[PDB]
Amino acid sequence: APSHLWDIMGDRQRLGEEHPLQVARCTKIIKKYVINLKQIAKFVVGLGERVSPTDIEEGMRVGVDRSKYNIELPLPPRIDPSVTMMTVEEKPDVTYSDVGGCKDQIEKLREVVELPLLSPER
Amino acid sequence: IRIFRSELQRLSHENNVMLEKIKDNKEKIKNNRQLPYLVANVVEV
């Protein structure tokens, strides 16, 4: 069912050449941009049509076209590691009231952690 | 006297005519220079 609606807009996003971009990390910024590919190939490029001059930063993955190299869209850096994506959990089962006892191992932790996050202006 | 000064006066005019050809060649060079080039390592000069 969802595949039928995506085939209508798939004319401009497939037949035309946009997505086939070669992603690489930028090195030098001259305001000429020296960028090294994943195949260890250095070249020179410049901004695009909708590309902003303040978006390009040093040490950032920047996708460029494979035929005629030009900056198209910026990408967040550090794309190589896949390990830390699984290190983030969501909604732990243990609640705050699961810790028993009135002793000082509770209140001391919430004041140095939960207090500055909930009330930073205190 | 006027002959010696006429050749030097036309010399600057002939240089300006050839200068337009140099400016047109520089425009062709600037047209031949487009950002996507490649970087190579110099071996021997």
**DSSP one-letter code for A77:** S
- CA dist A89 and A79 (Å) reads 20
User: Do residue B37 and residue A34 have CB atoms under 8 angstroms apart?
Assistant: no
By what method was this entry solved? cryo-EM
User: Do residue A46 and residue B37 have CB atoms under 8 angstroms apart?
Assistant: no
Tell me whether residue A26 is exposed, middle or buried, using C-beta atoms within 10 angstroms of its C-beta: 0 to 12, 13 to 18, 19 or more.
buried
**DSSP one-letter code for A98:** G
Cα angle B6, B10, B12 (rounded to 5 degrees) comes to 130
Buried (b) or exposed (e) across A33-71, using 16+ Cβ within 10 A? bebeeeeeeebbbbbeeeeeeeebeeebbbbbbeeebbb
- CA dist A99 and A109 (Å) reads 12
For B35, which residue in chain A has the nearest alpha carbon?
A45
**Which residues neighbour B39 within 8 Å (Cβ) at sequence distance 6 or greater?**
A34, A42, A43, A44
For A43, which residue in chain B has the nearest alpha carbon?
B38
> How close B15 gets to chain A, by Cα (Å)?
34
User: Do residue A46 and residue B35 have CB atoms under 8 angstroms apart?
Assistant: yes
> How close B34 gets to chain A, by Cα (Å)?
9
By Cβ distance, the residue of A44, A46, A70 closest to B39 is A44
Cα angle A93, A94, A95 (rounded to 5 degrees) comes to 110
User: Do residue A69 and residue B39 have CB atoms under 8 angstroms apart?
Assistant: no
What are the chain A neighbours of B36 within 8 Å (beta carbons)? 43-45, 68-70
Long-range contacts of A33-39, Cβ-Cβ distance < 8 Å, separation of 24 or more:
A33/A62, A33/A71, A34/B39, A35/A62, A35/A64, A35/A69
